[PDB]
Design an enzyme around this catalytic site. Structure first.
Site, PDB file in Angstrom:
ATOM      1  N   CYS B  42       0.814  -1.213   0.000  1.00  0.00           N
ATOM      2  CA  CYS B  42       0.000   0.000   0.000  1.00  0.00           C
ATOM      3  C   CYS B  42       0.862   1.285   0.000  1.00  0.00           C
ATOM      4  CB  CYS B  42      -0.948   0.019   1.203  1.00  0.00           C
ATOM      5  SG  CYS B  42      -0.207  -0.437   2.750  1.00  0.00           S
ATOM      6  N   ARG B  47       3.297   6.397  -2.211  1.00  0.00           N
ATOM      7  CA  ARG B  47       4.471   7.252  -2.409  1.00  0.00           C
ATOM      8  C   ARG B  47       4.749   7.500  -3.923  1.00  0.00           C
ATOM      9  NH1 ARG B  47       7.895   4.732   0.741  1.00  0.00           N
ATOM     10  NH2 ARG B  47       7.741   6.142   2.515  1.00  0.00           N
ATOM     11  N   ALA B  64       2.033   1.349   7.382  1.00  0.00           N
ATOM     12  CA  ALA B  64       1.185   2.405   6.844  1.00  0.00           C
ATOM     13  C   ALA B  64       0.561   3.324   7.896  1.00  0.00           C
ATOM     14  CB  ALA B  64       0.059   1.784   5.915  1.00  0.00           C
ATOM     15  N   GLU B 375      40.342   0.151  14.920  1.00  0.00           N
ATOM     16  CA  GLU B 375      39.720   0.294  13.611  1.00  0.00           C
ATOM     17  C   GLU B 375      39.718  -0.999  12.833  1.00  0.00           C
ATOM     18  OE1 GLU B 375      40.605   3.602  11.306  1.00  0.00           O
ATOM     19  OE2 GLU B 375      40.894   4.892  13.069  1.00  0.00           O
ATOM     20  N   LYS B 481      29.181  20.570  13.315  1.00  0.00           N
ATOM     21  CA  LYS B 481      28.252  21.198  14.252  1.00  0.00           C
ATOM     22  C   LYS B 481      27.804  22.628  13.922  1.00  0.00           C
ATOM     23  CE  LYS B 481      29.406  17.725  17.872  1.00  0.00           C
ATOM     24  NZ  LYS B 481      30.647  17.188  17.232  1.00  0.00           N
ATOM     25  N   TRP B 554      21.226  19.811  28.018  1.00  0.00           N
ATOM     26  CA  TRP B 554      20.139  18.829  28.148  1.00  0.00           C
ATOM     27  C   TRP B 554      20.889  17.565  28.509  1.00  0.00           C
ATOM     28  CZ3 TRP B 554      14.827  20.119  26.830  1.00  0.00           C
ATOM     29  CH2 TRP B 554      13.920  19.043  26.867  1.00  0.00           C
ATOM     30  N   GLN B 565      23.229   7.286  26.891  1.00  0.00           N
ATOM     31  CA  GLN B 565      22.947   8.047  25.696  1.00  0.00           C
ATOM     32  C   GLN B 565      22.403   7.044  24.735  1.00  0.00           C
ATOM     33  OE1 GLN B 565      26.100   9.472  22.414  1.00  0.00           O
ATOM     34  NE2 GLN B 565      25.436  11.182  23.731  1.00  0.00           N
ATOM     35  N   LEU B 586      28.951  12.912  32.343  1.00  0.00           N
ATOM     36  CA  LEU B 586      27.889  13.506  31.508  1.00  0.00           C
ATOM     37  C   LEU B 586      28.267  13.519  30.039  1.00  0.00           C
ATOM     38  CD1 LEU B 586      26.864  16.632  33.669  1.00  0.00           C
ATOM     39  CD2 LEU B 586      25.164  14.930  32.849  1.00  0.00           C
ATOM     40  N   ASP B 593      31.544   2.874  27.463  1.00  0.00           N
ATOM     41  CA  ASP B 593      31.066   1.540  27.086  1.00  0.00           C
ATOM     42  C   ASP B 593      29.844   1.533  26.170  1.00  0.00           C
ATOM     43  OD1 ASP B 593      32.850   0.039  28.881  1.00  0.00           O
ATOM     44  OD2 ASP B 593      31.416   0.642  30.513  1.00  0.00           O
TER      45      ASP B 593
HETATM   46  N1  LIG Z   1      23.478  20.122  24.742  1.00  0.00           N
HETATM   47  C1  LIG Z   1      24.054  19.163  25.485  1.00  0.00           C
HETATM   48  N2  LIG Z   1      23.659  18.971  26.793  1.00  0.00           N
HETATM   49  C2  LIG Z   1      24.211  17.987  27.631  1.00  0.00           C
HETATM   50  N3  LIG Z   1      25.182  17.126  27.245  1.00  0.00           N
HETATM   51  C3  LIG Z   1      25.595  17.281  25.966  1.00  0.00           C
HETATM   52  C4  LIG Z   1      25.130  18.218  25.056  1.00  0.00           C
HETATM   53  N4  LIG Z   1      25.785  18.079  23.863  1.00  0.00           N
HETATM   54  C5  LIG Z   1      26.630  17.071  24.073  1.00  0.00           C
HETATM   55  N5  LIG Z   1      26.553  16.558  25.311  1.00  0.00           N
HETATM   56  C6  LIG Z   1      27.366  15.414  25.867  1.00  0.00           C
HETATM   57  O1  LIG Z   1      28.605  15.470  25.198  1.00  0.00           O
HETATM   58  C7  LIG Z   1      28.863  14.263  24.388  1.00  0.00           C
HETATM   59  C8  LIG Z   1      29.614  14.749  23.164  1.00  0.00           C
HETATM   60  O2  LIG Z   1      28.806  15.695  22.357  1.00  0.00           O
HETATM   61  P1  LIG Z   1      28.409  15.287  20.884  1.00  0.00           P
HETATM   62  O3  LIG Z   1      27.472  16.334  20.366  1.00  0.00           O
HETATM   63  O4  LIG Z   1      27.929  13.829  20.747  1.00  0.00           O
HETATM   64  O5  LIG Z   1      29.789  15.536  20.149  1.00  0.00           O
HETATM   65  P2  LIG Z   1      30.996  14.499  19.736  1.00  0.00           P
HETATM   66  O6  LIG Z   1      30.588  13.097  20.204  1.00  0.00           O
HETATM   67  O7  LIG Z   1      31.097  14.666  18.248  1.00  0.00           O
HETATM   68  O8  LIG Z   1      32.228  14.954  20.433  1.00  0.00           O
HETATM   69  C9  LIG Z   1      27.457  13.714  24.152  1.00  0.00           C
HETATM   70  O9  LIG Z   1      27.532  12.336  23.775  1.00  0.00           O
HETATM   71  C10 LIG Z   1      26.805  14.021  25.495  1.00  0.00           C
HETATM   72  O10 LIG Z   1      27.247  13.050  26.462  1.00  0.00           O
HETATM   73 MG   LIG Z   2      30.382  13.347  16.875  1.00  0.00          MG
HETATM   74 MG   LIG Z   3      28.820  12.260  19.752  1.00  0.00          MG
END
Ligand SMILES: Nc1ncnc2c1ncn2[C@@H]1O[C@H](COP(=O)(O)OP(=O)(O)O)[C@@H](O)[C@H]1O
Ligand SMILES: [Mg+2]
Ligand SMILES: [Mg+2]
Ligand SMILES: Nc1ncnc2c1ncn2[C@@H]1O[C@H](COP(=O)(O)OP(=O)(O)O)[C@@H](O)[C@H]1O
Ligand SMILES: [Mg+2]
Ligand SMILES: [Mg+2]
Lengths: 603, 601
Positions: B42, B47, B64, B375, B481, B554, B565, B586, B593
């Protein structure tokens, strides 16, 4: 090294090949990168265009000889069909020659007729290095990305390059920049070289009886439609100089590019597209056609006014143009029959030019040719079939729609039950658009085509707008073929030397210049009004397009030569010049019935 | 009729085929390079109808019924995004011709739901066309498959299905007019919480639980040992509704990212924000035009919990974690999970094989990795997908083995010509080789086409015009970014986007933010600052000198002792799985891991 041997590379990894052909060792010569044509293997122009395209995504228009590049004033940016300015600087200029620049040689000496082109790769204090094809035919030292170095003299801020050859002439260099300082003005041709001249064959009774070969089917189809006739007096012809043809070639290639650029602008903006009065239901299809068949146009015809005042284009018949048989065959036979001179018919290669275009199209192996039931289209359709045949395609000519039918599931088949999925047509797209407009107040969610009918009645639109039928000319050609595009071209290239001020109302300037009124989807010189600056109607024609939207174009009357107004036409085949022919008429308005006048280009 | 039999046409000549399987790459239906769907479901008919008649398309969907939740259509010729509104069955908004008609799952359309196109509206009914209901030839020239009774009471329109156990959700119209429309559904936070779990310890991971006989698994062990996380008996789960949401977001964000890429490549002022050497700009554009559909795979990083789903970035150039999610975690599950859930990345290797099958890669693909044992298994995992899709390969480790013949052609260790490459390298590494020179006024990318000692650099391969490279050069744009503020600018307050800017603006001061280098990766040089204006964390790395972007703070949720994550993979532009990354901190890093994940209904 032998032809096409890899000799090394210019900056960025752009190959440099040997272009040494020898008597001891035709489509295969076209060099392409994707769908973009680079040139002919492996000439100087081919390398320069490819260098520019692989490194900066830009290209310059098709040219007969390298020296002509120096006369160009822009480059096409391929990814967005954009137009960039290109300035020229004479050798001995305050404008230093930077890496990346085009370096052009006028014809002369070592570069006898062709002239030459190379790319400047690096600038020094007293020399520059350049890369090029068609000078060096031996492998370059390993990793060296230039073919020659030329001494550069720098005196009082002025730059001069000296060639390694003793009898050549360096025109200068070219830079893609908006900065006009130190630049040369665009070369303008002397009016006198554009004048059309009458001439007369000696009357030895060469056109007394059956001068056209009735053995040739094509010529006989032509006689069935017209008799053994090309023009009123076959002993009379017109001539144009070679400089003039060169100018025609140059304008054809440039205006084709301008028109496709204005076509892109149109398709990118609903307000512009709305001006064309094409059924809104087709708009997304128009956009898709432009996106995927961008390079699939086979041939079109531009109508021009040429004389001592210059070169001006009235229109571009890009959807369905004819006169190809007349220009490319009947006139050939006319010359063969009675011309004993040195000059030539500028349309002599039309059939081969067409065959090439078809070879490089993506047309299916079997192409159905759709013409209407008018003996006049017979020869046009057969002349094209000849080009298709030469290019190796199989064809079948449909005369009218009666032979077309559908199977039970609704597939489109011809009179022999064969599937129809690729057509070249003589029909104007607009004719099919009328079939959608007839039922305009219905609430269709799609182009209302039929996929079946009790009486198997297949309409034009039931073929042309079937999504899987590959049609030529492509759908988007209706845009450059619609005069609503003239005001847009004037807006994009205000005061361009080949354009006439065109508008959707009789604006102030048109008021003072006088204008021509033309339906946006008309043709054949129908419904045309010529109005003088003294506000008097100079001429008017009848025709079926009186209800259509009109445009108003600055009056620019055909010259009258030897008792007839003469119009110059050029053909485009695959987007480039493919020839010139003349139309002559007792009035200011050329029409379908106007004569084709024998034209001989004299050196 | 048998499978694929033409039964007729819907308006405008859109064929309607039989999809009777009763009578693997052959089932993909494309029109040019645009993927229409699976023959002959469908969704595929809907599409193809919308693309052939209006040149627009809707994003990939598992079933769908999900179309009803979409709020945009992509305009193919300019990669533009048009608003799509949804109206419930029984609406003041009449179902016009051209509209998508969606069924929810249930009854006749059990799990899938269904979709049709409305072809004509009357006073007491509508006619529709569709593909997976009627499998027999249609009445000659009839361009509709069924008619549904339409009841019209007091300005309100209601359709009744021909089936007695089905549920019609409504219809959708491509229009800016929001009146009568449905608000875009939003999932209940609770369904997005990640929960921890534990396997029963019966010693399933005591010794060599990874099969060292499998070269891939051994390459993984040589680099990491017989290990995946700190405690293999522990795992995490997410609901099937959360997975459906991750799928939905991955597909939408990939199209949003491509939309912002198109906008960037159309305006120098935006492109300049990326700090990519100007000499490459024309090339980035050519790449975007010619390799539009050639991206093989990428990875988005998300924060997902009761507050919803936010995307941190999209590693669209060189992303890894595929082996972990699609092989090692499969072995983990086979070795120790006995529940009802599933590894949402289980089909990753097959998904990649498909992407390759339809890519335009050349017959022989050289795989380019760096000399890092880490790698080796990534390169090899990708080699397997390439092999499965019928491609010949050779893995090049480092640049030592490459050379040039006398004319300057690029060759590998056995004299073979290198003209198609899949790299683990980031394009930025090559861009650095251009930046290094930067003094001279080169007229082209400064690549070598010969060297006395035959020394080939990364750029001497990747930016050679005739080497077909995956991922395509254009991906550096969604992977940089600097595209985040552009994404925010284009889709202000989108539910999955975080406010991102190039300076700490006022709203960011109030929320706290993450400072992130535009071309960084792996969690390097990240600074997390709170609304209290305190540094919650900072990482070091090789990118401290680059331009930064500032993104609304965030923070990842902490579940069972670790910040988790969520990542999803895109394969060929569509969802290709999910995995988890966990850290004591954070900021997720290269060494964070990979945490076993099980999706449960
Ligand atoms: N706006 C945000 N608020 C809180 N933690 C963040 C935010 N952006 C990134 N992080 C933390 O930083 C890590 C690295 O940022 P990310 O955007 O994935 O860049 P990269 O992995 O390319 O270095 C994320 O996996 C997360 O743990
Ligand atoms: Mg990245
Ligand atoms: Mg990243
Ligand atoms: N601006 C103009 N000034 C003077 N004559 C014009 C002008 N435009 C057109 N004509 C005359 O009218 C004829 C018809 O116009 P044209 O643009 O060729 O339309 P078509 O041939 O499609 O009807 C031309 O061949 C020319 O003789
Ligand atoms: Mg005309
Ligand atoms: Mg015309």
């Amino acid at each position: 090294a032998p032809f096409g041997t890899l000799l090394g590379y210019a900056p960025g990894g752009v190959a440099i090949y040997s272009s040494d052909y020898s008597s001891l060792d035709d489509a295969v010569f076209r060099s392409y990168i994707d769908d973009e044509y680079m040139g002919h293997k492996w000439q100087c122009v081919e390398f320069a265009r490819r260098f520019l395209f692989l490194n900066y995504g830009v290209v310059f228009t098709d040219v007969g000889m390298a020296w002509e590049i120096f006369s160009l004033r822009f480059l096409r940016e391929v990814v967005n069909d954009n137009i960039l300015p290109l300035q020229a600087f004479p050798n001995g200029s305050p404008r230093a020659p930077v890496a990346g620049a085009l370096l052009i040689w006028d014809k002369g000496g070592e570069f006898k007729d062709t002239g030459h082109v190379a790319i400047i790769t690096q600038l020094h204090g007293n020399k520059v290095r350049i890369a090029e094809q068609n000078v060096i035919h031996s492998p370059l030292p390993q990793g060296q990305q230039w073919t020659r170095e030329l001494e550069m003299v720098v005196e009082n801020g002025c730059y001069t390059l000296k060639d390694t050859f003793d009898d050549t002439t360096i025109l200068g260099w070219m830079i893609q920049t908006e900065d006009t300082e130190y630049s040369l003005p665009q070369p303008e041709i002397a009016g006198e070289l554009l004048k059309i001249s009458g001439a007369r064959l000696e009357n030895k009774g060469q056109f007394d009886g059956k001068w056209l070969d009735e053995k040739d089917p094509l010529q006989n189809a032509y006689v069935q439609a017209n008799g053994q006739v090309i023009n009123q007096d076959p002993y009379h012809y017109y001539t144009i100089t070679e400089s003039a043809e060169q100018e025609l070639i140059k304008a054809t290639n440039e205006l084709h590019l301008m028109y496709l650029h204005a076509t892109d602008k149109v398709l990118k903006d609903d307000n512009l597209l709305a001006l064309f009065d094409i059924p809104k239901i087709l708009w997304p299809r128009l956009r898709l056609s432009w996106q995927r068949r961008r390079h699939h146009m086979i041939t079109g015809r531009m109508d021009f006014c040429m004389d001592e005042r210059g070169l001006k284009v009235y229109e571009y018949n890009a959807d369905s143009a004819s006169c190809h048989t007349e220009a490319g065959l009947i006139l050939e036979r006319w010359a063969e029959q009675g011309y004993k001179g040195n000059g030539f018919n500028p349309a002599e290669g039309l059939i081969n030019e067409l065959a090439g275009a078809w070879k490089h199209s993506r047309a299916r192996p079997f192409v159905h040719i759709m013409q209407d039931k008018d003996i006049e289209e017979n020869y046009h359709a057969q002349f094209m079939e000849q080009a298709l045949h030469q290019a190796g395609f199989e064809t079948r000519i449909l005369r009218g729609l009666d032979e077309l039918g559908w199977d039970a599931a609704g597939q489109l088949i011809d009179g022999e039950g064969r599937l129809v999925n690729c057509v070249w047509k003589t029909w104007a797209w607009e004719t099919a658009f009328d079939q959608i407009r007839e039922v305009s107040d219905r609430e269709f969610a799609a182009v209302p085509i039929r996929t079946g009918h009790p009486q198997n009645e297949v309409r034009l639109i039931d073929v042309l707008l079937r999504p899987e039928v590959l049609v030529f000319e492509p759908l988007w050609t209706v845009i450059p073929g619609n005069k609503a595009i003239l005001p847009i071209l004037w807006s994009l290239f205000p005061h361009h030397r080949y354009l006439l001020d065109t508008d959707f109302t009789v604006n102030d300037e048109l008021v003072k210049t006088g204008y021509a009124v033309k339906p946006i989807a008309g043709r054949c010189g129908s419904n045309i009004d010529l109005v003088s600056h003294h506000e008097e109607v100079l001429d008017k024609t009848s025709g079926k397009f009186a209800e259509q939207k009109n445009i108003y174009q600055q009056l620019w009357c055909l010259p009258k030569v030897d008792g007839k107004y003469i119009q110059v036409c050029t053909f485009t085949v695959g987007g480039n010049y493919g020839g010139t022919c003349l139309r002559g008429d007792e009035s200011l308005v050329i029409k379908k019935e106007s004569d084709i006048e024998p034209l001989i280009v004299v050196k």
